[PDB]
């Protein structure tokens, strides 16, 4: 269990937490604003998934400051997580390419 597989695994777990908490915080922030469609938990969870994966169909979109602020956190946490995995996959491939040589 090296670092790159530990961080990537921890990123996946953290991403799940952000998706769940993001759904809760989105509804809590979007309600009270007339015209907002992100006001129920199940679809807010679906919105979080297509937000963290960047994607963004447009069927659901935050219209409040805190609702959009939550979205930004979801985006970054999504991009970083899916990006931390790629960096982990590279370290795996690089470390094995040395084994196909003299290291």
């Amino acid at each position, epitope marked *: 269990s090296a670092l790159h597989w530990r961080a990537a695994g921890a990123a996946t777990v953290l991403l799940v937490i952000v998706l769940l908490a993001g759904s*809760y915080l989105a*509804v*809590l922030a*979007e*309600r*009270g*604003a*007339p*015209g*907002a*469609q992100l*006001i*129920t*938990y*199940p679809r807010a969870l679906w919105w979080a998934c297509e937000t963290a994966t960047t994607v963004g169909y447009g069927d659901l979109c935050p219209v409040t400051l805190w609702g959009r602020l939550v979205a930004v956190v979801v985006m970054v946490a999504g991009i970083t997580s899916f990006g931390l995995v790629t960096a982990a996959l590279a370290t795996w491939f690089v470390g094995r390419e040395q084994e196909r040589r003299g290291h």
Partner: antibody
Amino acid sequence: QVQLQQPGAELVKPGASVKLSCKASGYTFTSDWIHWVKQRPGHGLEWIGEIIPSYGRANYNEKIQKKATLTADKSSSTAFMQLSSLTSEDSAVYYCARERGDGYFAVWGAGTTVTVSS
Amino acid sequence: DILLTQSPAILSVSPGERVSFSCRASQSIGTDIHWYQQRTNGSPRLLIKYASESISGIPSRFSGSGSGTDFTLSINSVESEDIANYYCQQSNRWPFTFGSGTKLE
């Protein structure tokens, strides 16, 4: 079991105030929203406002005159609606309902018949 | 705010006949509409959630359909205990709104 409990009636004279209660039972999640619905005799349902006991945040209907204050109490699982400075137009039956956060009102209360007179 | 129009206000029907209630939204709300029932001096009771999804406890007599702006609550062969006030409620955009209501006789 009766999930939502409300007082039978509340008599208020114009200018005064009243604090209705909505003691809830059954499954109490963290995503539960307590709504309040006003219904005048002969008329239909009217959404007053909503509140989430978990966070304490409350939203209200903006199209009508705002004279309601929603507070909660997680210790006793009871929602409270504070009506201030009422007139004859505010005399109606006030229902409270529980929403699981999925849009619809699963269960309603018996409703509190608030009468405004001297 | 989304406006929900229920026409007609009073719906008269013979016993054992199929009766359909109407609910029209001022804008497309998908299937985020919900039907309720309120008898004389009673509390509203959920009949149909999300346009067509049925509720446990509610008789199979009731059914729902529609999508977008037009929705319909139908009762296959109506009986005496179905005499009440029927309201529709949307949950697509904040705030939640109700219909004007429809009286069944």
